[PDB]
Structure formats: C-alpha cells, structure tokens
Symmetry: C5
Subunit: 212 residues, 5 copies
C-alpha cells in the first residue's frame, strides 16, 4: 500500500529508538568493560541512524525516493565503520573476553568498506554504470568479508554474527539494483535487521536473556 511504505520508515525509526535505549541503559550498568565498549558503539549506531530516519520521515509528504536513497550514503558512511568495529571487537570478546583489534587490520576493513560504498555511490550518481557499480561493489564486499573472516575464531556467536552480517550486507547490493521505491522499502527493512535486531541480539546475548 501507500500505507506500508510509510509504515516501513516509522517501523525502523521506532525500533532504532528501542535499540538505542536498551544498549544505552546496559552500557551504563554492565560490569564488563569490554561489553560496555560494544554496547556504547551500538548506541551510537542507533543515534546516528535515528537522526537520518527522522529526516526521511520529515520529508514523506513530498517524498523523492531517489533523493532519499542518495541521502542514505551519509548515514552509511558513519554507521558502517562503527558496525564493523563492533563486529571485530565482538569476535574477540567471544574468544578472549577482551575488546581489542589491531588498528592496521581495522583500516584494511575500512578501505574495503569504503571501496564498496564509494563504488555504489559512483554508480548511483552515474559517474560509472550502475551495473559496474554493482559488480565492483560486490568485489570490495568480498574483500571486506574475507578480511573479516580472518579475524573470526569459530564459535556459535561468531558464526551467527558473521553469517548474519554477510547475508544482510549482501542484500543491500541486491536491493541497490531495484527501482527507487522498492529499494527504499528494502533498505528500511534491511536496516531494521542489520542495525536494530543485531543491536538487540548483542544486548540479549551479553545479558543472557535466552536459553538456546
């Protein structure tokens, strides 16, 4: 419907407020400093993404779908590095109970990440063909997730986390190719999973809320 399109913006916006609140409160109370650092970063992701969604929502009346998708890049440029830092710190917490990563390794991750995003952007503004942007983008994505895989030690949380990021982030590249309207809706739903459900997972995991 016209309804469900607008609803997708609100759903993600409100779930970002939920995720931001839950990680904020636990970041302020966890006794584990490494968990605090992860939950602190996670709060920042929700804060930033919520800001951009509030902008999008403020423009719904005369919505320009293409404009919105281009604006998302500003959000992505800020949140993707934070999300990736969280991922690699979490790998290490799961292995050694300390949040640490080599800065050099992290800069290589970011290089691949920004190659991926920058290529996507060049395609959207027509500096390169969209088709080329897609393939070159996915190549950088491959470099990103290969490098990520080298920092991962095998265990249930690390495998789920890696697998979730792999699939969710790949789907951005899939939705990239769609028309502006369905692309927006897909991205809204992907953000709900990649930011909010991931954040809620981190909280629930460290809080030991669930028995498997």
């Amino acid at each position: 419907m016209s309804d469900l399109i607008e609803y997708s913006f609100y759903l993600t916006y409100a779930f970002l407020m939920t995720t931001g609140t839950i990680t904020f409160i636990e970041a302020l109370r966890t006794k584990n400093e490494s968990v605090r650092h992860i939950l602190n970063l996670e709060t920042c992701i929700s804060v930033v993404a919520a800001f951009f969604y509030s902008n999008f929502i403020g423009k719904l009346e005369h919505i320009n779908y293409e404009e919105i998708n281009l604006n998302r890049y500003v959000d992505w440029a800020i949140t993707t590095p934070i999300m990736l830092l969280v991922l690699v710190l979490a790998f290490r917490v799961n292995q050694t109970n300390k949040a640490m990563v080599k800065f050099s390794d992290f800069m290589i991750i970011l290089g691949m990440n920004y190659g991926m995003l920058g290529t996507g952007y060049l395609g959207d503004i027509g500096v390169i063909h969209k088709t080329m942007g897609t393939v070159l983008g996915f190549l950088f994505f491959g470099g990103l997730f290969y490098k990520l895989n080298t920092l991962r030690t095998s265990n249930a949380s690390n495998d789920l986390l890696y697998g979730a990021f792999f699939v969710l982030w790949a789907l951005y590249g899939v939705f990239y190719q769609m028309e502006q309207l369905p692309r927006n809706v897909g991205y809204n739903v992907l953000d709900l999973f990649s930011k909010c459900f991931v954040g809620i997972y981190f909280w629930a995991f460290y809080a030991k809320i669930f028995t498997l």
Copy 2:
C-alpha cells in the same frame, strides 16, 4: 471529539511518567534481572510515547480510522517487548533470574503476530472484519495458552497473567467499535497495559507496597 484529545494527552503524559520511573530504577537497581525487565519497560514507554506524540501532532490532519491503522506499527514493536517482559518476570519471580527459552519466545511471537496480523487484515478489508475478530481471538487463545504453560503459580505471576489476559482481550472488544470510540478505548487500554503495568513492575521490585 474532545474526549479523543484529553485521552491522548493523558496516556502520553503517563507514558512519560512510566518511562522516567523505570529508567531511573533500571540505572540504580542492584539486581541485574530487574534491570533487564525495567530496561525493556523503558523501551516500551519510549516507543509508545513517540507514537502518541505523533498522533497528537497530526490530530487535525488525519482521521480516526488512519490513527487506528497507524497504531499497528506501535503494537508491532511494543507487544513483543511487553511479552518478553511478562515471561522474564515469570522466571524472576521464581528464581530471581531473567531468562526464557528462545524457542518458547518465538512461539509466543508467532501467536502474537497472527493475532495482530489477522486483526489488521480485517481492519483494511483484506478479510471480513468479523473474520478478523474470530481469527484474532483464536490467535489470542494460542498466545495465552502458551503464556499459561510458562506461568508458575505465585501471587505476582497470577496477577500478571490475569491482567495481561483481561487487558489484551479488551483490545479485541474495542476492535468491534466505530473508529472514534475505538480510539478512546485504545488510548485508555494503553494507559493500563503499558503505563499501569510498568508502574506495577517498578513498585513490585521496589517493594513499595505491602
């Protein structure tokens, strides 16, 4: 009419109250299990408060029907958190540990979203309103049957179960009514189901009442 406006403000203002009370106690309780429950409760008030502020802001720009359709977005976010709180509280009251089996929680959510989804489909004409009611209440039955299996008897658990049972059933009753009185009813139900329940959790864990 005027009823609509006052009832919106009442619930909105009480959500601020509930959110503040649970936030402060989440940050200061020495019991981590209570923190998790009160943290979740704070999320509920934050999300609902956002929706109420939006409804109030748009009151002269949207109709009663649209507001009721929009509530589903709020419900889609708040109902799962509320149910998580419920089942976590069940265990906290028994063992002082906030845990539930993820599989049990996913079954709870399945029933919850069948309830909400079939209600929504009836509301938008995809199925007959009356089927919305029947299927909704059938899923409601599944939901509370499953909740009951995780309820262990004690005073608090029984009160909580009963309160949820009655309040949540009443949403299905007000679903029957015309758009205006339905809005007012939902406003008041939210006051009870989110705000007064949230204050109960606070007061219960704070040992405010004998």
Copy 3:
C-alpha cells in the same frame, strides 16, 4: 502580563526541581530516598509538560480552557504526589518507603472523587456550589485517611500541614474568576510541586540545620 510571567516562573521552577531530584535519585545510597525522589522527578516532568503546552497557547486560547486542561495534569500528578507523601511518612516511621496498596487505593478514590466532582462543577454538569461541597467532602475523606497513616514528628507534621493547606487552597481559588484563578493555580503549583520537591531533596540531603 504577570499572568504570563507566573506561567514561566512555575515552568522554570519545575525544570529546577526535576533536575535536582533526578540527579540525587541517581546518586543516593538510600533506596527508599531514591524511590521518593524518582516519583518527585516524575511530578516535575509531567507538570513541566503541561506548562510548556499552556505557554505555547497563551495567544490562541481562553483562560477557562487552560483551567479545564489543568485537570489532566492533576489526574496524573496528584496520585504521584500522594504516593510520595505516604511513602515519606513511612520513611520517617520505619526507614522504609512502603504503604499498604489497599490504603493507597482508598486515598486515590477520595482524590479522584474530589477532582471529579470539582470538574463536574467547572463544566456545569452540577453547580459550582455543589462541586465545592462534594469536592471538599472527598477532600475531608482524603485528609482523614492521610492522617491515619501519619505518626507525629516534625517532618510528618510539616508535610501533612503543607499538603492540607496548599491543597485546600485549590478549592479556594476554584471560586475565583478564570484569570485570577490561573495565577492562583500557577502559584499553588510552585508551592505544592516545586517547593515540596525541593524540600524533599534538601531534607534527605541534610542541606539545612
């Protein structure tokens, strides 16, 4: 003029009171004091919200409408204020913030009887004189019940007395025309919410000799 200033004075004092109780609620090592200051913070939060609304409207709305709107604020703040009062009595008498729920429900019943009958009088469903008479009957029940929970001591007596007088004065100002009644209620809120809030903070913080 000073009718608009009175709105700002109370609004700004609510911000002060809310800030002061918030920070101390978050730092006190006494859990009972935390519960009381937590509730006090809520009172300031809610009343501040309604005052920001009244202020946003001073051009667009008549003074009767503002007074009727206050009942929504009152319906929320009064039960929290009463809960604080009985918990404070209890803290003085037992070092613990507790009350019997049944006792609190009786208190709330009297309170809403009082507010409800007052409201009915304000909107003309019953006469103003009947609103006052029934209102004060419920007021009497309320303050009678409150007194049965009160043990004698400096703080409990000061508190009980403060509430008794300040709350009776709402019923006094109820008799006035709409404009002075607004100024009156603004000043009473400053006392009943803000100065009481500040009292609790100062008392538990042992700021004064």
Copy 4:
C-alpha cells in the same frame, strides 16, 4: 543589535557547556557535598539556558526592554540557587560538609528578593528608577553583609565572595544604562556569574589546576 545577538548565543552556548560539565561530575563525584553543589550548579545552567533559548527565539521580533523585564523571572529562580551554592561552598571549604542554617538562608533570600523586587518596581515605573537603584543597592548591601558573616577566611572563600560581590554589584550598574548596552552587559555578566563560576566549581573540586 549584532553585538547583542552574538552575546546571546555566546552565553547560551556557554550555559550548555557549564551544565554538561557539572552534570557529568555531579553524577560521578564520590564526595556527597560536592555532588550537592554541582547538582545545584547544573540547575542554574538549565534554567538560564531555557531563558536564553527564549530570548534567542524572540530575536526576529525583539523588544530590548521586554527582554530585560523577562530576565527577572530567570533571576528570581537562579539567584537563590546561586546563593545557596555560595554558602554551601563556604562550609565545604572549611568542614567538607554542605550545610547552612535555614534561618540564615531565609535572611539571605529576604535581602536577595528585596533587591530584585525593588529593581523590578523601578523598571516598570511603580517607583522611579533612581529609587529602584538606591533601595536595590541597600538590599544588595544587606545581602552581602549577611553573606560575609557566614564566610570563613580561606583562599577559595575569599575569591568566591569577592567575585560574587563585584559581579552582582555590576548588575546594579548596568541597570542604569540604556536598554541595548544593558542587555549586552547582562549577557556578559551572566557569562561570568553563572558559567565561569560554574566552571570554577567543577575545576576546583576536580583539582585540574595547580
């Protein structure tokens, strides 16, 4: 006009700074007396920042005389808090306990409000400005006489007492000026009397300066 615009924004932004720094430290200091002082200082910034945001929002329909009259509502709230901070600071500097006699503080407030009240009556013409100045300054003297009696000799106490005496006296001096320079002067005095004093307390108790 520009001068007064820029000076509004300067003080407003510095109030945000001061409120943030005292807020965070009030929440973490292990000294309860310092907490009370920093809590109070936070309130001062919150209130004054509210009023400055108001002045700023009024700029496009600005009435300089109106701004100066509105300041009295701010002063009526912030001055008692500032004075309470001052006398508690005196005591902390000697016994490390934030306490004062209620009766002493009520006398302080009596003088403070005589001062503000008579100044106000002069501004709105109930009495002549000159009579406002004379009464105002007499109340100022009573206030600072009483303040001085609660003051123990001490490096911090002396700097504080002197800073307050001078800065507060200057409000009475700018009261005499035409509305424009009066506003700019008040904006800068507020910067010193609220913000710089607030940052002093933080820095002093945090021991960041040798």
Copy 5:
C-alpha cells in the same frame, strides 16, 4: 552541489556520535582524570552540534559568509575546551594526573584568543585578509610554541601535538579561500579536529586498539 550540504550533515552526525561515546565512557570510567578529559570532550561535541544544527537550519536560504562569521562563536567556546583537553591529556599520558598550571592555561588562552580575534577582524574587513592571516598565524605560533613546552615526549603526545598543529594550521589555510570552499573545508576540519580527535581519546583510553 550535493556534497556541500552533505558535509554539514556528516559533521553534525559525527558530533552526535562522538558526544555519545565520550558521554557514556565519562560516566563509567574508574579513572577520574580520564573522566575529566572525556567530560570536556563531551562538552565540545554538544556545543559544536548546537551550532551545526543552526547551520543546517539555514541551508535553503544559506549565506555562506554569514555561516563562516557565525563559526567564530562556536570557536570561541570550543577551542579553549579543546586546548584544556590537550594539556590535560599531555599530563595524563606522563603522570596519569589531569592537571595544568592555571597561569600556563591563561597564556595558552591569550594566544588562542589573539589568533581568533585577529582572524575575525580580517573577515569583517577591519584589517586586510592577508594581515589577519599573518598576525593570526603569529599568535598560532605563540600558541603552539607554548603547547610544545608543556608536552613531554611519547607516542600519544607526539601524535596529539602533530594532529592539532596540522589541523589547526589548516583552519588558517582555508581562511584564504572563497566563502563556499571555505565552509566545506571547515566542515571537514571540524570532523577531524573535534570528532576524530574525540574518538581517538575514547579509543585510546578504552584500549580497544593495539
């Protein structure tokens, strides 16, 4: 065209990020010297975010020269905090105590305000643009000479000193450029000088990198 507007949003949103991260760690670190640094860092993000929200508000009908003039108010508040952080950071890295001589800090501020003030006179045409450039950079030299004397050698201090040196000098470079490129340059420099520096402090004290 897009990139210019985007540069405001990037820095604004990164300020929100930096403010959040230092706020949470300020409230939880067990080292109070680190708290004081992170407290100050939070203030910087709060103040700059306020001004960036203002600029973003003005993008439709944007006057590039006005914005750059407006920035001086931001600068007048944030630069002294940033310099305080820098010198406390020097000491914390060497002694693990956040302390500086007040006299040293006032000399630093003298130079800092000489730099900003002369730069401002150049912009508003009271002195020629190349003059402001030359004199401003003289004060900058004084500032960074003095800072260097407070610096003791080590990895973090050398990095911090070099980053501040280069970034702050670059404000002087972009000062020569036309209003539009100058805005974009300042937006990016603020990202580095406030946000990336603040994130560095957080990461450094949290020891998340090796």
